[PDB]
From Swiss-Prot, chain A:
Taxonomic classification: Bacteria, Thermotogati, Deinococcota, Deinococci, Thermales
Protein name: Large ribosomal subunit protein uL3
Top-rank taxon: Bacteria
Any Gene Ontology CC annotation: cytosolic large ribosomal subunit
GO BP annotation list: translation
Pfam families for the chain: Ribosomal_L3
Swiss-Prot record, chain B:
Subunit structure: Part of the 50S ribosomal subunit. Forms a cluster with proteins L3 and L19. In the 70S ribosome, L14 and L19 interact and together make contacts with the 16S rRNA in bridges B5 and B8.
Sequence similarity: Belongs to the universal ribosomal protein uL14 family.
Coiled-coil segments: none
Name of this protein: Large ribosomal subunit protein uL14
Biological classification of the source: Bacteria, Thermotogati, Deinococcota, Deinococci, Thermales
Function: Binds to 23S rRNA. Forms part of two intersubunit bridges in the 70S ribosome.
SMART domains hit by this protein: Ribosomal_L14
UniProt entry tagged with the keyword Nucleotidyltransferase: no
Organism listed in the record: Thermus thermophilus (strain ATCC BAA-163 / DSM 7039 / HB27)
HAMAP family for this protein: Ribosomal_uL14
One GO process term, biological-process aspect: translation
Transmembrane segments: none
Keywords: Ribonucleoprotein, Ribosomal protein, RNA-binding, rRNA-binding
Entry GO terms, CC: cytosolic large ribosomal subunit
NCBIfam families (UniProt xref): rplN_bact
UniProtKB/Swiss-Prot annotation, chain D:
Gene Ontology MF, one: structural constituent of ribosome
Keywords: Ribonucleoprotein, Ribosomal protein
Similarity comment: family membership: Belongs to the bacterial ribosomal protein bL32 family.
One GO cellular component, as annotated: large ribosomal subunit
Quaternary organization: Part of the 50S ribosomal subunit.
Designated name of the protein: Large ribosomal subunit protein bL32
GO terms for biological process, alphabetical: translation
InterPro entries in the record: Ribosomal_bL32 (IPR002677), Ribosomal_bL32_bact (IPR044957), Ribosomal_zn-bd (IPR011332)
Functional note: Found on the solvent side of the large subunit.
Curated annotation (Swiss-Prot), chain E:
InterPro entries with a match to the protein in the record: Ribosomal_bL17 (IPR000456), Ribosomal_bL17_sf (IPR036373)
Subunit text: Part of the 50S ribosomal subunit. Contacts protein L32.
Protein name per its UniProtKB record: Large ribosomal subunit protein bL17
Family note: Belongs to the bacterial ribosomal protein bL17 family.
Gene Ontology molecular function, alphabetical: structural constituent of ribosome
Record keyword Metal-binding present: no
Entry's Gene Ontology cellular component terms: cytosolic large ribosomal subunit
GO biological process: translation
Record-linked PANTHER family: LARGE RIBOSOMAL SUBUNIT PROTEIN BL17M, RIBOSOMAL PROTEIN L17
Domain of life: Bacteria
Swiss-Prot/TrEMBL keywords: Ribonucleoprotein, Ribosomal protein
Organism field: Thermus thermophilus (strain ATCC BAA-163 / DSM 7039 / HB27)
Lineage of origin: Bacteria, Thermotogati, Deinococcota, Deinococci, Thermales
Amino acid sequence: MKGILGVKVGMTRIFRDDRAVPVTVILAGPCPVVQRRTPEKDGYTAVQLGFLPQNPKRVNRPLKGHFAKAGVEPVRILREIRDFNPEGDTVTVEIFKPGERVDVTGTSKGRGFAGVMKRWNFAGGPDSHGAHKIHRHPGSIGNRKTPGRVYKGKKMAGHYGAERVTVMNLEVVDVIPEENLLLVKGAVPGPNGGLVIVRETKKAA
Amino acid sequence: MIQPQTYLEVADNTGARKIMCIRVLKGSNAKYATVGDVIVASVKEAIPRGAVKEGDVVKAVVVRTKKEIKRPDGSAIRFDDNAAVIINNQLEPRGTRVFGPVARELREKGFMKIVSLAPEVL
Amino acid sequence: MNRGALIKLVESRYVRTDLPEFRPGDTVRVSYKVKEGNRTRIQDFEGIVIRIRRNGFNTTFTVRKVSYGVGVERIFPLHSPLIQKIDIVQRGRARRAKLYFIRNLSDREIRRKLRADRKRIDQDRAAERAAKEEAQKA
Amino acid sequence: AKHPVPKKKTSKARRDARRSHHALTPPTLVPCPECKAMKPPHTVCPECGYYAGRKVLEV
Amino acid sequence: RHLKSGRKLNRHSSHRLALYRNQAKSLLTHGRITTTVPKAKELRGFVDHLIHLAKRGDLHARRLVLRDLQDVKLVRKLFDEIAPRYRDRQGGYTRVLKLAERRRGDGAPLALVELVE
RNA sequence: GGUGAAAAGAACCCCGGGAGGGGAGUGAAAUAGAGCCUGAAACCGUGGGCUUACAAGCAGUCACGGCCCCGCAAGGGGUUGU
RNA sequence: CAGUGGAGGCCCGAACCGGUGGGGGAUGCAAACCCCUCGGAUGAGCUGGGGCUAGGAGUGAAAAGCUAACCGAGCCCGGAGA
RNA sequence: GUGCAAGAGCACUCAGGCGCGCGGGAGAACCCUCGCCAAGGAACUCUGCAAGUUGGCCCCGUAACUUCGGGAGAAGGGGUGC
RNA sequence: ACCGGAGCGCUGUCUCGGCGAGGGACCCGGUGAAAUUGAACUGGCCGUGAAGAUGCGGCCUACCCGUGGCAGGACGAAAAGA
RNA sequence: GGGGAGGUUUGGCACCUCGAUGUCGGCUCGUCGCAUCCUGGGGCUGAAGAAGGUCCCAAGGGUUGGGCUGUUCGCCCAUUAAAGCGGCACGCGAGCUGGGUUCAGAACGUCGUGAGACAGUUCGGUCUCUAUCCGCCACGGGCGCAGGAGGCUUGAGGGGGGCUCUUCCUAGUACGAGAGGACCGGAAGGGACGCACCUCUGGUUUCCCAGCUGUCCCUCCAGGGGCAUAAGCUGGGUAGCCAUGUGCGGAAGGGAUAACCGCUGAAAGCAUCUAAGCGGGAAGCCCGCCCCAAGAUGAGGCCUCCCACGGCGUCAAGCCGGUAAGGACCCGGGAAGACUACCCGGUGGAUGGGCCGGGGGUGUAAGCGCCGCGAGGCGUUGAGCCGACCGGUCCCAAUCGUCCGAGGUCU
C-alpha cells in the first residue's frame, strides 16, 4: 500500500490499445518525504509528503528545514501516507508502473447550497397541473403526530460542494518521469489543477 | 434512447410496416433500448395482403435509431429514424427482405441473420 | 508544470499530420473498420460530412452520407482508428460549418447549394507535378 | 397576519440575544503620507491624498 | 457553481451595455471621473480595451468604437489628441481609485477614473 | 383642565443650518422652563455589586456553601454554586 | 343564368362592452386586482344628462339575485336597560 | 409620419411627455415571469388544464348531410423577398 | 368560450430533468408594521396522565448565541363550530 | 370440536377535542414491523434430475412501465429473480393536487297534495405570500481546552453503502426409457442504484460570430446605432453548468453465529449434534470500504517555534501597557461562497484588468480594384472580430501603513 501526491491536469481519450481511453493526468512530480511516524511516539506508520517548491519569506519559522534534512517546504505544503515506509529520497511518480489500478483522494469542487433535486435527489413534480409553488421542492418530511419530529438526517436541502472524496479502482496506463505525469482512466474528482493524492488500490488485499 | 410509446417502422417483408414500442426484455427496470436491443411491439400499421396483421403483438430488434451510439473507439453512427426488425418468440427474423444500412453492433449481439443480407453494414 | 495545455501538447505523439485538408462541405472516400470475430477489415466510408469540432488533441468530424436505405451520420475521432480515411473532392463555399439544414431537406438542394472553389483544384493541378518539380529542385 | 404567528411572547433577554450577535462594528483608519491626517486604507483624502494627490482644493 | 466564470451585472443586458457606453463617453470627454467601485472596475476594463483600439487608426476600429459610442468630434479628439499620447502605452490607460465618505444616502464604495499620462 | 403669588415667561456669550443645548440671568423654588404642579406602573436605557460558556427548566422553595455591602457584638441584606 | 344592388338579433376583429380556461396575487397595487386566452362585436347593442318605481314594498331573460362593499327582508332612530 | 390586404390593429418613431419618491452590491437554495433542449412523443394527468403546432393576403381544393342559406378558412396543399 | 370517447399533427405534461434570464430572495446604508402573545429557563425515548408531554416519573442528547433554509409538532394562527 | 394471539377490516363504548382535531385517494418524502413477494440457507418430501409442494432462520437490499376507473381495491397489457402484506391521525393540504366529497344554481329519475326533501344520479363551483418556539440540514460569532504561534494528525462515536439478471466452459458428462436435463468451480456481457467527472456524445452561453425584417437616426451612398424582452428573429456556438454522456462503488477476505449440519461423550453398560469440549454453516451480526469527526469539557497525539520583572499582588491567584513566534485590519482576488467562513496573492508581485501570442468560436468582413442596366457577384480572403479560456507582459489597480498578540497556576 504505497502512494504519491499530485495535482490534476488532462482528461481526453487517447487511442491506446485500439480502443478509446478517457485520460486523466496527474503531476505527482517531486513530492517530498520529510518525516516518518513510528508506533510508540505516534500510533501507526505514516509519512509526510510535500509538493511544489516556491517558498521564501512568506513561510519561515519552524520550516522543518529543521526536521533532519531541510530541503525547504514546497508551497502546497504536505500530507500523509499511512502504512507506507519508503526508502528515503523525495518520491517522484514512477512509484506506480503502468498497468496497475489505484485509489485516489481529492477535494470535490464547490456547488454550495443547491436545490434538493440537484443535491441528494428528490423529484419535485407539478410543473403545470398542480401548482407553480412547489416546483423544485421536497414536499414532505416526517409523519403526522407520532413521531411528531423531524427524522435525524432525513435527507434535506443544503450544501453539496466544498467536500472531499476517495475514488477506487482507476487504471493507469502511462507515467512520464520526463516531466512527472500519470495517465489514468478518467474519473478525476475536483477541478483542473488542485489537490489530489494517489494511493494503491484495494481488491483482495 | 428507445422507450415504450414509441412508433417504429419495420424494414422488411414481414407483413407489416410500422410498429409501436412496448416494454423491453432487459432487467425489470431497463426502460431503455438501442442498437441490438430486444423489444416487444404492438403492430399498428401493416400491408393488407401480408402475414403479421394490423394490431399484432410480436417481438423485435433495433437496427437503426435517431440517437446514435458510441463505438468504444469513439466513433458513433446514426440512421435517421426508428427502424427495427420483427423477431419471434424464438429469437428469429421472421421475413427475409432486409432494407438499408444496419449496425454491426447487432453482429456481436447474436443477429447474424441481419448482418448477412444486410446491405451496408455499419 | 503550470501550462496544463503544454502537458496535453506533450501528449502529442498521437497526431495525424498526414491527411487531406477539407472544409465542412463535402469530403467523401474511405475510412477504416473492424468487422468479424478477429477484426481484419477497413470498410470504406465516403460521405458529405457536416461538422468540424476543433479541440487540438481530438478535433472530431461528423460525416453525413445517405445510402441504400436513407441518411446516416458517422462521426470520426480525427486521430487513430481511421487509418488513411482520404476524401474525394472536398468542396465548400459554405457559410456556417454546421450543416443541419441538410438533415431537413436532403435532395437536389444539396447540389443546388454547393460549388467547389475552383482555386482549390487549381492548387491541386499545381501541387500535382510541382511535386515532381519538387522531386527535382532542392 | 398569515400562517406563522408568534406562539407566545418573545422574552426581553432573547431580544438582547438576537441583538447580541447584532451590535455595531468599528471602522479603521490609516496615516497619510505627505500629509497630516487619517484615511480609510488604500484611499485618497481631500485633506491628504495618494501619490501626486489630485483635487485637494478644499477651502 | 454559479459565477464560476466572471462578469458583473445588475441592469438589463441592453441597459448595461448602454451604461458602459455612456461611461466611456462622459469619460473620454473629461478623464477624471467619480463613480461606484464595481462600475469603475468593469468600466476601466471596457474603456481600456476601446482606447487600445484607438491606439490604431484603421477606419475599421474607428467606426467600431464610434459604433459603440456617438459623437463624431469625439472620434476626432480620440484619434488626434487622446490615443496619440497613449501611443507608447500598452495597457490600463485609465486608473480608478477609491475615495472616502461612501455615496451618501445609502453608503457606497466610490472611486475615480483617470487619464493616466 | 391646572407655569408661578406675580411674566419676572430667559437679554448676552458659546457649539449648531436649525433643532436643541452649556453658563449667565429670573425668583422662595427652573428637580416650577412654557400643554410646564404633584410624576405609580408597564416601559426602554446607564453605571455599578453578585452569578453564568459539561448545561434538562411552573423557574422557586429549604438547607449548605462562597462573594460583596451593612452591623459595637450576636444579627442582618444583596447574590447564586450545590 | 348574368350583372346589378347591399339585406341581416350575419361572419373575422379595434375603440366599447363582458368575464370563459389557467397562471399570479391572498395583512395584495387592490374590501375582486393583473398577465395570458377568451365571447359579443348594426343590435335583445352600448354610452353621458335629466326623471321615477322601496322594506313585506319595489326591480327582477328568475338566483330569493339588486336596492348603497355583508339582503331569506336594507339603513337609521325610537319602545328598549325586549 | 413609415410599413403590412387595409385600418382608431401592430413594431419604430413625429410632436408632446415620462423614467413610475429608496437605492447599492453581490450574482445562493428557492420563488415570479421568460428562453433552448438531445433522443422518445401524451407514456403525465382526474383532464393534452397548461404550453406549444397552426398563423396574414392571392391561387388550387373540400365529405357526410342539409331546412339549399350552410356545413367551409372544412381538411389537404401552393406561393409570397429582391 | 357548456360534460364525455377517439384521431392526426404538435409540443418539456411526462421519462427527467440540465444550463440560462432578469426581478425578488441574500450583505452595506435610510424608513420600517402586522396577526399572536399566562410566564418561560421550550432537545429525545419508554411509559403514564381526562387517553396525543421539553413541563410527571423512570430514562435519554448535548458548550453560549445566532444567519440561511425545510416543514413533523407546539392538538400551530384566523372561526365564543356552518 | 377446543385454546391463543395480532389491532390491518368490520363493530360495542363515548373519555382529550363542538370559543374547531380539514374527512377520500394521488404527487412528493419516507421510516420502521416481519406472521418474507424476490434474492441466501437448511430440514422434510407422495424429491431421479429439472423444477415444484411445505416448514424453520434470515429485512441486507430490492419490490418495474402502461389501459380503464376520482377510485386505495381490483381486472387487464407488456414484462421481472420478484411485482410483499402493514403501522405511523388508515403517515404526510401552515408540502402540493382539489379530481372524489356532504354548501347555495340547475336538472335528472324520485318521494312528497305541496314548500322542499332522497348511502339515487349528473354539470358547474375562492387551500388564507413573511416560521416566534421545538425538530431536522447547511453556516458562522463568543468562550473553551488550567503557557503562548503554526503545521501534520489519532479515531471515540456515528453516518452512508451493502442489489442483481442472462450468456457461454466444465458436459449434454450424473441422473434419466426418453423428453428433459445438474451440482463444483470458472468466463463474459446486462439492468436498476450510489459516487464523482467535461475527455468523447449531446443541450446549454443575456451580445462570442453571422444572415434578416419594418424602422428611426448618425450622414445622401455605403456604412453604423438603438427599438422591437426584461437578446426584435433565426442559423450556430469556447469555457464554466450538465445527463443520455463518462470512469468508478457493491466487493474480494477476516471474526463470532442463527436455523440447521457434524465430531469425541456420559449421566442411563447401548444411543445422542451437548449438560464439559471442538468444526462446518447465511445477501444477515462485527470488521474490512467511503465520509464526517478531539465541544472524544476527557478538549487527546506528533513535527517543530518564541519566551521572564516591564508597573501595583513581597509571601496567595490576579491585574495593567507595549512586545517574541505570530495573528489580524484594508486590499487584488478564487472551478470557494446566501453573509460569514475556507483557499491564495499583495511590488522581493503575475492577484484582476489592459496588452501580445496561443487555442477556440464564428465563417472570406469594413474598405479597394473588377463584371451585369440591376439585385448582386469574382477576387483582395479562411479574412475580420473575438465572453469566461493555456500562458507570456508590472502597462494600471494590490500605496502607505494600522492594531491584537507569551512576561510562561499549582501539587
